[PDB]
C-alpha cells in the first residue's frame, strides 16, 4: 500500500496502534477476537 502500487487493502486486516497511526482506517466490519485451538477427544478407561 504505502509505496505506490495499492489503494485498498480488502483482506483480513486488523486494527491496532501503529497501523492506524500510519494510515486511516474505516469503521470495522467484523468484531472477531483472538482465541486458542486444540484437538478433540476420544473414548475412555475401565479396561477389563
Amino acid at each position: 500500500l504505502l509505496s505506490g502500487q495499492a489503494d485498498m487493502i480488502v483482506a483480513p486486516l486488523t486494527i491496532n496502534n501503529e497501523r492506524a497511526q500510519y494510515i486511516e482506517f474505516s469503521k470495522p466490519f467484523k468484531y472477531q477476537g483472538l482465541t486458542i485451538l486444540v484437538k478433540k477427544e476420544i473414548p475412555r478407561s475401565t479396561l477389563d
Partner: protein, 48 residues
Amino acid sequence: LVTTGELFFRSGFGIGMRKDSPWKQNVSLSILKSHENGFMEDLDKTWV
C-alpha cells in the same frame, strides 16, 4: 479439532485506505450503511 478458551484483547477487522484519499469518507459510510441491512449477517450466514 476444536477451539477453546475465552477472548482476550478484541480488535476488529476493517478495509484499509491511504492517507487523505477522496474515497475514505464514502467507503466508511457505505460500510456503515450496509452493516444495518443484514448484509453482513446475510453473507456471514451464506459463507461462514
